[PDB]
Every structure is written in structure tokens, then in C-alpha cells.
Amino acid sequence: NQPDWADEAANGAHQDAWKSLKADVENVYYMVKATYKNDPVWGNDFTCVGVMANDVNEDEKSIQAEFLFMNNADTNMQFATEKVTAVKMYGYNRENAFRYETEDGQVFTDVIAYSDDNCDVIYVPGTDGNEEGYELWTTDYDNIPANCLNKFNEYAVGRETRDVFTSACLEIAAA
Ligand SMILES: NCCc1c[nH]cn1
User: Fold this and answer.
1) DSSP string spanning 122-166?
2) Which residue is closest in CA terms to ligand 1's atom 7?
3) CA diameter of the chain
4) How far is ligand 1, taken at its centre, from the CA of residue 27, in Å?
5) Is the beta carbon of 100 within 6 A of some atom in ligand 1?
6) What's 41's DSSP letter?
7) Which CATH class, in words, describes the domain spanning 1-175?
8) List the disulfide bonds.
9) Any idea where the domains of the chain sit in the sequence?
10) Distance CA 24, CA 85 (A)
11) Which of 57, 93, 114, 123 is most enclosed, with most CB atoms within 10 A?
């Protein structure tokens, strides 16, 4: 049993997890939308989630990721560092998932449903003590690519979509 988009022959070309993780090294990726409200790490009604990486390890297909985020329990931006490794899920031959490992050893395995050069549509299976759902991440929180947005809306049908990282997360300019 697995999502119908988890068809490697059909969709694998757009589900390259290692390529997507390395992309976090060049540009910050912002989670612009999601279909769920709570994350065990980011908190409740979490918003303003972004990530940047460094320390690419080709032998391990892992990076060190630095996250920023907000939730309804603190008015200040929060930060955390986690290791993320490209792994295989749903019988795939080429890595199509992200295995996050927090400093306390907690593990989350999410799956790339669709990914293009500057955006990712990620599926949260809901088996890591968390809510099942989808996330949309992109490098520019103000200009969302239509291809990823359409794929996110397509796969996330029947749920309640909400904004996560938007310009409201920052107070931009001066004076
Ligand atoms: N679906 C996001 C799970 C996660 C990873 N790190 C923190 N939370």
C-alpha cells in the first residue's frame, strides 16, 4: 500500500531526494504551504519554516540542516539543527525520501512526491507520531512555481491547505 504518485517508473525523474537535499546548500528553502497544523518539533500552528544546509556528505547522502520556524507558543523565531539523509521509501531504487534526525535522536522520514529545481512537494506519511499530510517548499516565498503548486494542490486534494512561510513572517525594509 502506497500513494498512487509513488510510482518510480512513472514519476521518479521528479523525485530525486539527494538532488533536492543538496539544493538546500545553495539556497534557503521555505515551506510556503502545508495541509497540517502541528509538527512534534516545529510546534502547533507552526509557520515561517525555512531550511538551509551545509556539509554535504556524498558517501552518506546526508547534509546538516539549519531550520528556522515559529509556532503559537513563542512570539520569537526559533531555530534547530538536524541531520537529513536521502533514503529509499516505497520500494524505490533511487532515494526518494528525507530521513531527518534531531539532536535528541528523534527520526522523521518524509517522501518527495514531486520536486523540480527550486521546489519540492513533500509527503508526511503520519507514522512518526505526527499528522499525515503534505508540504510545499520553494526558494522564493513570494513567487511560487506553478508546476510545484499544481502538483501540491493535485496530491493534497480533500484537505485544508494553509500558508506557512509568507512575507508576514518578516518585517522587511527600514524606518
Ligand atoms: N514533516 C516534518 C517533520 C520534521 C522534520 N524535522 C522536524 N520535523
Assistant:
1) EEE-S-SSS--EEEEEES-SSS--HHHHHHHHHHTTTS--EE-S-
2) 41
3) 55
4) 19
5) yes
6) T
7) mainly beta
8) 48-169, 119-148
9) 1-175
10) 12
11) 123
